């Protein structure tokens, strides 16, 4: 780090998992584990669908599913441009809009840490935080 | 005694203070068994050279079409809901646990191990 | 009362997923090839040929995971409950129109 | 709308006759005389009405061997019509396909007396619509308040 | 004189010649998993697509020189086509502005006015117009329905007979009184008595069923595995059970197990009888031994052949034979 990290962070709700600064979002599960109803297995796999959705501007070719074997609880691993991986903790009762919110919210912190070490950052297309917008009628 | 005797599996616990009820600060726990950081090297390679983990593209092509698939035998329209995750694993768990073809080539040495006792007994017998 | 009103949410998916564990460990487990690490590595090879063997499951292989499904069960109970409410209009407007008939 | 309408209207090119016995002129206008009327609306509100532009001979009209001018491709002329039992479900559709008032269908179900084994399918597809006209009726009210017949009507 | 083919309903498809180049142009360039911005729809003639307000404008609202697309259109639509066949173009614009368009056969309303020879304004629903317009006969709708297939990758996703009731209804909604229905008498024939005409239908109309079912059952054997799963019927449950069975799901569970058709996994007496001991406390079905339930608690959407198949599973060597192999 070239400077102490940020203090304040924007606080807004993220619909879609746009590639803010991540480089590879892998989602590991073990189908040997099973469950009917809302479990973590379901919460993580819809996050795959919700990421691969035709709606989210996430690059569909950059998300990697990974069937495990050894009863690996569903892992969601995001890797940023600097290569520091991040597993959003899958607390029980979680679901899609949380993980799409966790990783996107952390995306601003992690992209901040990359911007602290000295990594040059790119222009981002989406602006989840409405800043150039005004509500019109 | 390792809890999950599989030494590569490592149990990680994380308890968090998240805002529930809009104002509160409750205790939420994210318990999980994940692979030891030992088993992280050969997995941050994209081919999944680490075994026990299979690129989903292997068991079938284009999960972009296998998980994004929407029920439509005749449920077209608004009722073309996605598939329930409970079978969408099954059609992939059943594909994982298929018959892989044990070839008789391995069976020869194993057969060469089948007649192990019967013929090694007279070897030391006939060799005095 | 706490562990009750949450049991509305989980015991039935548990009463199910604890019956599959029974079905799994009874019928498929005996005939399950335990050398999976070799088996998976075979499909990572079948994929590097491209012409590999991803096989689709069949009904008899799949009916193991046949379960009471409130995705459908709870739904078509409403619709059938509803096409009785849709049934009690033509049978109502036939009854009302049947009140104008003399005795 | 004007667009999406045919400009050139090809005419019925009879390919081959469906009979060897000519339908003599006398009976032609004896059976066509019956067709100039066609029922409409299926209940007590049965309404025998008139049909404009009646074809002249219906022994030849469509039963076989006439062409229909839906000519679409380059090599596909006005297709010939095979005989009746050569099209699937036709004399079965004759039982099913028609204006069905639900008044007339629910007495058939609660008495399980369907003329056809598909009227159980033309019933659902009819109620499954009317429920949709509600699940859209209400997924709109979650926006605003839409009130029926509250604006002026007519001129 | 000459009947082209005498078979009980083998003309459900276009000629393999015309069906060859049927889907050469009516094909869906596969969805790139992008986020669509605009799903436009046009009527365009055979190959007379212009850069004008009909097409070039909506591109020019977005700055696309639609002088190109019209050519890429005519790179696929100028041949193959009888003159003046107004097609529908389903232009689909993605967030990268790259379009993808499916050309489609003319709207069936365009077909219907051709097959009856009526221009714009001559046709109408009787309640607006007072008269049935041009006649038709079911024999004609079956050929408007052959060039109208929703899945121009799977030419018969809706079976043809199912497709006709659609075009028939759209016709009646335009005033097109077809003869086979809507009238006192069907199409008169010089062949035989009305009875000798009706006695030749009672055989044909039912031969089609074993034809239509088999095609409905072959479809379900390739249908999604979830589709062939068990979904019990709800016609027996009376609307107080049907409501008292929604407050507590336990009843709709024990019901499912109680009336599941026999399988290798549901031949557990205690599992089936555990439910049967739950319902009796709830006063539900009590006089119906397991058999008369399965025949009424079956997925009615099964083709008769297949419901009959699942119903007799215990007879089929028991399902105790068919199991998850390994």
Per-residue three-class SS string for chain D: CCCCCCCCCCCCCCCCCCCCCCCCHHHHHHHHHHHCEECCCCCCCCCCEEECCCCCCCCCCCCCCCECCCCCECCCCCCECCCHHHCCCHHHHHHHCCCCCHHHHHHHHCCCCCCCCCHHHHHHHHHHHHHHHHHHHHHHHCCCCCCCCCCCCCC
Q: What does R_g of chain C's alpha carbons equal in angstroms?
A: 26
Of C9, C24, C36, the CB nearest to A69: C36
Contact list in A for residue B52 (CB cut-off 8 A) is 68-70
DSSP per-residue string spanning E72-139? HHHHHHSSSB-SS--EEEEEEEETTS-EEEEEEPPPHHHHHHHHHT--TTT---HHHHSSB-S-B-HH
Instruction: Give the tokens for residue E211.
Output: 């034809």
DSSP per-residue string spanning E180-233? SSSSSS----SSS-HHHHHTTHHHHHHHHHHHHHHHHHHHHHTS-TTTTS----
Convert A104-117 to b/e letters by CB count within 10 Å (16 or more is b): bbbbbebbeebbee
Query: Contact at 8 Å (CB) between E168 and E141?
Result: yes
| Subunits with 3+ C-beta pairs closer than 8 A to D | C, E
Of B64, B73, B97, the CB nearest to E223: B73
Strands A63-68 and A22-29: parallel
Instruction: Give the tokens for residue C45.
Output: 């090879």
Convert B88-102 to b/e letters by CB count within 10 Å (16 or more is b): bbbbbbbbbbbebee
Does E325 touch chain B if contact means CB atoms closer than 8 Å?
yes
Rounded Cα distance, D41 and D103, in Å: 12
Does B75 touch chain C if contact means CB atoms closer than 8 Å?
no
H or E stretch including A77?
strand A75-80
Q: What does R_g of chain E's alpha carbons equal in angstroms?
A: 27
DSSP per-residue string spanning E287-325? S--HHHHHTTSS-TTS-HHHHHHHHTTTTTT-TTS----
Rounded Cα distance, E136 and E108, in Å: 14
Shortest CA gap E292–chain C (Å):
20
Q: Which of C61, B43, B89, C28 is nearest to A32 (CA)?
A: B89
CA D108 to mean position of chain CA atoms: 21
Determine whether D106 is exposed, middle or buried from the number of CB atoms within 10 Å of its CB (0-12, 13-18, 19+). buried
Of D6, D11, D39, the CB nearest to E182: D39
Rounded Cα distance, D54 and D58, in Å: 10
B interface mutation test: which of A59, A65, A106 has the most B CBs within 10 A? A65
Rounded Cα distance, E161 and C95, in Å: 36
Q: Specify which residues E177 forms β-bridges with.
A: none
H or E stretch including E170?
helix E160-172
Task: Say yes or no for a CB contact (<8 Å) between B33 and A48.
Answer: no
Residues 6+ positions from D2 with CB-CB distance below 8 Å: E120
Q: Which of E305, A58, A85, E249 is nearest to B43 (CA)?
A: A85
Instruction: Give the tokens for residue D22.
Output: 């000519």
Task: With an 8 Å CB cutoff and a minimum of 3 pairs, decide whether chains D and A touch.
Answer: no
Rounded Cα distance, B90 and C65, in Å: 7
Contact list in C for residue B98 (CB cut-off 8 A) is 55
Of B47, B58, B94, the CB nearest to C62: B94
CA C87 to mean position of chain CA atoms: 28
Contact list in B for residue A89 (CB cut-off 8 A) is 14, 16, 30, 32
Contact list in B for residue E223 (CB cut-off 8 A) is 73
Nearest CA in chain A to C14: A36
Q: What does R_g of chain D's alpha carbons equal in angstroms?
A: 22
Place of tokens 């001559």: E122
Rounded Cα distance, D98 and E270, in Å: 50
Contact list in E for residue B83 (CB cut-off 8 A) is 224, 226
D 91-150 residues inside an 8 A Cβ radius of E: 91-99, 117, 120, 122
Query: Contact at 8 Å (CB) between A50 and A56?
Result: yes
Query: Contact at 8 Å (CB) between E106 and D72?
Result: yes
- Helix C7-23 and helix E250-259, axial crossing angle in degrees, nearest 10: 30
**What end-to-end distance do the CA atoms of chain D give, in Å?**
23
Rounded Cα distance, E136 and E113, in Å: 11
Helix (H, G, I), strand (E, B) or coil at E178: strand
Phi, psi values for residue D86, rounded to 5°: -85, -10
Does C28 touch chain A if contact means CB atoms closer than 8 Å?
no
Query: Contact at 8 Å (CB) between E300 and E233?
Result: yes
Contact list in D for residue C79 (CB cut-off 8 A) is 128, 131
Nearest CA in chain B to C68: B86
Q: How far is CA E205 from CA D143, E25, E150, E182, E192, in A?
A: 50, 35, 26, 19, 18
Task: Say yes or no for a CB contact (<8 Å) between A54 and E31.
Answer: yes
Task: Say yes or no for a CB contact (<8 Å) between A54 and E33.
Answer: yes
Q: Which of A79, A66, A60 is nearest to A17 (CA)?
A: A60
Q: Specify which residues A135 forms β-bridges with.
A: none
Q: How far is CA E316 from CA A64, C62, D62, E266, E319, in A?
A: 44, 18, 48, 15, 7
Count Cβ atoms below 10 Å from residue D55 Cβ, excluding itself: 18
Strands A75-80 and A22-29: antiparallel
Determine whether E225 is exposed, middle or buried from the number of CB atoms within 10 Å of its CB (0-12, 13-18, 19+). buried
Rounded Cα distance, E303 and E54, in Å: 46
Place of tokens 């009947």: E3
Does C34 touch chain E if contact means CB atoms closer than 8 Å?
no
Helix (H, G, I), strand (E, B) or coil at B87: helix
CA dihedral B80, B85, B91, B92 (to 10 degrees): 130
Q: Specify which residues E89 forms β-bridges with.
A: E42, E103
Helix (H, G, I), strand (E, B) or coil at A76: strand
Task: Say yes or no for a CB contact (<8 Å) between E165 and D86.
Answer: no
Q: What does R_g of chain B's alpha carbons equal in angstroms?
A: 25
Instruction: Give the tokens for residue B5.
Output: 């005797």
Query: Experimentally, how was this structure solved?
Result: cryo-EM
Q: Specify which residues E100 forms β-bridges with.
A: E92
Q: How far is CA E30 from CA A20, B19, C74, E99, E130, in A?
A: 27, 44, 35, 12, 46
A interface mutation test: which of B43, B50, B89, B93 has the most A CBs within 10 A? B89
HEC string of C70-99?
A: HHHHHHHHHHHHHHHHCHHHHHHHHHHHCC
Shortest CA gap E144–chain D (Å):
7
Query: Contact at 8 Å (CB) between A48 and B69?
Result: no
Long-range Cβ contacts of C80-86 (<8 Å, 24+ apart): C80/E234, C80/E235, C80/E237, C80/E242, C81/E239, C81/E242, C81/E243, C81/E246, C82/D131, C83/D124, C83/D127, C83/D131, C84/E239, C84/E242, C86/D102, C86/D127, C86/D130, C86/D131
| Subunits with 3+ C-beta pairs closer than 8 A to E | A, B, C, D
Contact list in C for residue D121 (CB cut-off 8 A) is none
Helix (H, G, I), strand (E, B) or coil at A107: helix
Of C19, C33, C66, the CB nearest to E230: C66
Contact list in C for residue E264 (CB cut-off 8 A) is 27, 60, 63
Long-range Cβ contacts of B36-45 (<8 Å, 24+ apart): B36/B7, B36/B8, B36/B9, B36/B10, B37/B10, B38/B8, B39/B8, B44/A79, B44/A85
Shortest CA gap A2–chain C (Å):
43
Does C24 touch chain B if contact means CB atoms closer than 8 Å?
no
Rounded Cα distance, C88 and C94, in Å: 10
- DSSP letter for C27, please: I
Q: Which of E172, E187, E174, E128 is nearest to D55 (CA)?
A: E187
Query: Contact at 8 Å (CB) between E225 and D95?
Result: no
Q: Provide the resolution (angstroms).
A: 3.6
Contact list in B for residue A35 (CB cut-off 8 A) is 86
Q: How far is CA B119 from CA B73, B109, B111, B124, E273, in A?
A: 61, 14, 12, 10, 56
Phi, psi values for residue A68, rounded to 5°: -95, -175
| Subunits with 3+ C-beta pairs closer than 8 A to C | A, B, D, E
């Amino acid at each position: 780090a070239k400077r102490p990290l940020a203090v304040v962070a924007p606080k807004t709700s993220h619909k879609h998992l746009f590639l803010m600064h991540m480089e590879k979002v892998t989602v590991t599960v073990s189908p040997l584990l099973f469950g009917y109803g809302h479990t973590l297995q379901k919460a993580a796999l819809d996050f795959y669908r919700r990421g691969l959705s035709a709606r989210s501007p996430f690059p569909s070719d950059k998300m990697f599913l990974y069937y495990s074997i050894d009863h690996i609880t569903p892992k969601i691993e995001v890797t940023w441009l600097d290569g520091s991986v991040y597993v959003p903790p899958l607390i029980e009762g979680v679901k899609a809009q949380d993980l799409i919110q966790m990783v996107m919210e952390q995306a601003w912190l992690a992209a901040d840490r990359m911007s602290a070490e000295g990594r040059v950052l790119n222009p981002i297309a989406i602006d989840d935080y409405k800043w150039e917008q005004l509500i019109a009628f | 005694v390792s809890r999950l005797v599989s030494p590569r599996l490592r149990i990680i616990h994380r308890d968090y203070l998240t805002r529930r009820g809009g104002r509160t600060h409750q205790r939420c726990s994210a318990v999980a068994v994940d692979y030891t950081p030992t088993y992280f090297a050969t997995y941050k390679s994209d081919p999944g050279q680490c075994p026990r983990l299979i690129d989903a593209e292997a068991v079938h092509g284009d999960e972009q079409a296998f998980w994004s698939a929407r029920r439509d035998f005749y449920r077209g329209g608004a009722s073309r809901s996605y598939y329930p995750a409970w079978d969408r694993q099954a059609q992939a768990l059943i594909m994982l646990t298929r018959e892989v073809p044990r070839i008789p080539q391995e069976a020869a040495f194993r057969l060469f191990t089948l007649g192990l006792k019967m013929m090694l007994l007279p070897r030391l017998v006939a060799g005095v | 009362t706490i562990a009750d009103r949450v049991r509305r949410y989980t015991d039935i998916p548990e009463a199910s997923t604890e019956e599959v564990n029974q079905r799994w460990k009874e019928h498929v487990m005996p005939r399950l090839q335990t050398d999976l690490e070799y088996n998976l590595s075979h499909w990572k090879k079948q994929h590097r040929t491209g012409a590999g063997r991803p096989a689709p499951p069949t009904l008899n292989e799949y009916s193991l995971f046949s379960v009471p499904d409130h995705s459908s069960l709870g739904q078509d109970a409403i619709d059938m409950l509803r096409r009785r409410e849709a049934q009690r209009e033509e049978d109502w407007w036939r009854e009302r129109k049947g009140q104008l008939k003399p005795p | 709308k004007r667009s999406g309408k045919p400009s050139d209207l090809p005419d019925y090119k009879q390919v081959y006759l469906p009979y060897d016995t000519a339908p003599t002129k006398t009976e032609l206008d004896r059976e066509r005389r019956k067709f100039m009327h066609a029922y409409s609306g299926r209940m007590e509100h049965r309404k025998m009405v008139e049909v404009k532009d009646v074809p002249q001979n219906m022994y030849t009209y469509g039963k076989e061997g006439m062409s229909i001018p839906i000519s679409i491709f380059k090599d596909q002329a006005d297709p010939v019509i095979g005989p009746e039992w050569t099209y699937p479900g036709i004399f079965e559709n004759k039982i099913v396909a028609q204006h069905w008032y639900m008044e007339e269908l629910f007495d058939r179900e609660k008495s399980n007396t369907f003329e056809s084994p598909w009227q159980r399918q033309v019933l659902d597809n009819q109620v499954k619509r009317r429920l949709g006209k509600v699940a859209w009726r209400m997924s709109m009210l979650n926006i605003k308040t839409i009130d029926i017949f509250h604006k002026e009507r007519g001129a | 004189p000459k009947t082209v083919n005498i078979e009980p309903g083998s003309n459900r498809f276009l000629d393999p010649n015309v069906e060859a180049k049927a889907k050469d142009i009516f094909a869906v360039p596969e969805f790139p998993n992008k986020a669509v911005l605009h799903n436009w729809r046009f009527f365009i003639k055979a190959g007379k697509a212009a850069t004008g307000p009909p097409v070039g404008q909506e591109f020019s609202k977005l700055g696309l020189k639609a002088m190109d697309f019209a050519k890429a259109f005519n790179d696929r639509t100028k041949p193959h086509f009888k003159d003046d066949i107004e097609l529908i173009v389903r232009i689909q614009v993605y967030f990268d502005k790259s379009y993808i368009f499916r050309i489609e056969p003319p709207p069936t309303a365009w077909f219907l006015l051709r097959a009856i020879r009526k221009k714009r304004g001559e046709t109408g629903p009787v309640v607006l117009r007072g008269n049935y317009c041009a006649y038709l006969t079911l024999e004609m709708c079956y050929e408007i329905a052959k060039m109208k297939q929703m899945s121009w990758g799977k030419v018969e996703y809706p079976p043809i007979e199912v497709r006709v009731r659609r075009v028939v209804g759209q016709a009646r909604r335009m005033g097109i009184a077809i003869i086979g229905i809507d009238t006192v008498h069907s199409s008169p024939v010089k062949g035989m008595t009305e009875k000798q005409y009706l006695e030749e239908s009672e055989k044909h109309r039912k031969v089609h069923m074993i034809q239509y079912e088999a095609l409905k059952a072959k479809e379900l054997e390739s249908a999604p595995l979830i589709e062939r799963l068990h979904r019990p019927n709800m016609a027996p449950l009376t609307n107080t059970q049907l409501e008292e069975g929604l407050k507590d799901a336990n009843l709709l569970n024990a019901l499912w197990k109680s009336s599941h058709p026999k399988s290798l996994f549901t031949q557990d007496t205690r599992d089936r009888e555990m439910a049967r001991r739950y319902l009796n406390t709830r006063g539900w079905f009590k006089e119906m031994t397991p058999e008369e339930m399965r025949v009424v608690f079956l997925n009615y959407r099964l083709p008769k052949q297949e419901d009959h198949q699942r119903q007799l599973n215990m007879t089929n060597g028991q399902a105790q034979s068919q199991a998850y192999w390994s």
